[PDB]
């Protein structure tokens, strides 16, 4: 599993396409959170988090703030993630079993997934219309869904 992310701070990008992407039958992880820290086994460098919000954290998932992993692999160099950075993403759900009682919310961050930076301040960064479009997309997934 490897793909590529969208560019940071993209001007007026299609917010309705985000809803379509999050509505897809392959889509069952979708949340906004801080990237926290990273790991070492190169096909699954773990990418720990700080959960801010969720919209289709789907299959057998529960409430937010869990701070779980969202692993990455070396061939996905176009999907680099920044420690401490706020981010937005969408993709498939976690494989739900491990050495623990569940592997729950250990995200795969696989190929063809959505990824972008989430603005930590938007007033200072020119037009807040890009962050507002993301907020309208998140509101649409939360109100209308799929």
């Amino acid at each position: 599993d490897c793909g590529q992310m969208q560019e940071e701070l993209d001007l007026t990008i299609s917010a309705e396409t985000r809803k379509q992407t999050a509505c897809k039958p392959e889509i069952a992880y979708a949340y906004k959170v801080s990237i926290t820290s990273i790991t070492v086994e190169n096909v699954f460098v773990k990418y720990k988090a700080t959960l801010l919000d969720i919209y289709k954290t789907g299959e057998a998932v529960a409430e937010k703030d869990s701070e779980i992993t969202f692993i990455k692999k070396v061939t996905c160099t176009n999907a680099e993630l920044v420690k401490g950075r706020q981010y937005l993403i969408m993709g498939k759900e976690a494989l739900q079993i491990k050495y623990n009682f569940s592997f729950r919310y250990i995200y795969p961050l696989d190929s063809l997934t959505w990824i972008e930076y989430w603005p930590r301040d938007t007033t200072c960064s020119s037009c807040q219309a890009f962050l507002a479009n993301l907020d309208e997309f998140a509101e649409d997934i939360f109100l209308n869904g799929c």
Binding site: K56, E63, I141, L143, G145
Partner: protein, 193 residues
């Protein structure tokens, strides 16, 4: 010798072991057991009852929240921002699921926002409190006995007084043109004794 036999425990009793056996030269039987279990735990765990609710979706033998999008079929109403005085449309189940998730929210009056369910609909798009009439393009409001949806309980003013009622019953009263005014997505104090 060469004759065959097939074996089962009695009705509803759970046999453990191989099913059938053959009589060899003149004495052996194979591959049957020395000792056996004709019967077992034929009754499962029953009424485990995980703690669901109208804003909720219990799992793993425990309570849990539901997703606000899964709560989307709730009745439309006016509301206000999580950190501002501005009014906007909302639905009671989506707001309750958000509050179950620890998210902020605020109330509004019955005319404070452009809620889609605020008046009677047409055929082909009716809310859970109504349905299309036979050979007709208009929707019709149902009676309170037509409560096929689960529904929240909510606070509303009727006949000049505050009273608690089901979300589907308040929706039927709203759709049929009865004089009402919603006051909160929580129920009233009126049931206190």
């Amino acid at each position: 010798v060469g004759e065959k036999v097939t074996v089962s425990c009695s009705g509803g009793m759970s046999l453990e072991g191989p099913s059938a056996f053959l009589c060899g030269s003149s004495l052996k039987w194979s591959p049957e057991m020395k000792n056996a279990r004709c019967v077992q735990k034929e009754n499962p765990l029953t009424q485990a009852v995980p703690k669901c609710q109208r804003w909720e979706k219990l799992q793993n033998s425990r309570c849990v929240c539901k997703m606000p999008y899964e709560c989307g079929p709730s009745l439309d109403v006016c509301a206000q921002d999580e950190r501002s005085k501005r009014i906007l449309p909302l639905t009671v189940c989506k707001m309750h699921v958000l509050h179950c998730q620890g998210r902020n929210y605020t109330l509004t009056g019955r005319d404070s926002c452009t809620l889609p369910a605020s008046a009677e609909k047409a055929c082909g798009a009716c809310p859970l409190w109504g349905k299309c009439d036979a050979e007709s393009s208009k929707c019709v409001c149902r009676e309170a006995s037509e409560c096929e949806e689960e529904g929240f309980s909510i606070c509303v003013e009727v006949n000049g007084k505050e009273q608690t009622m089901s979300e589907c019953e308040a929706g039927a009263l709203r759709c049929r043109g009865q004089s009402i005014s919603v006051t909160s997505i929580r129920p009233c104090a009126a049931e206190t004794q």
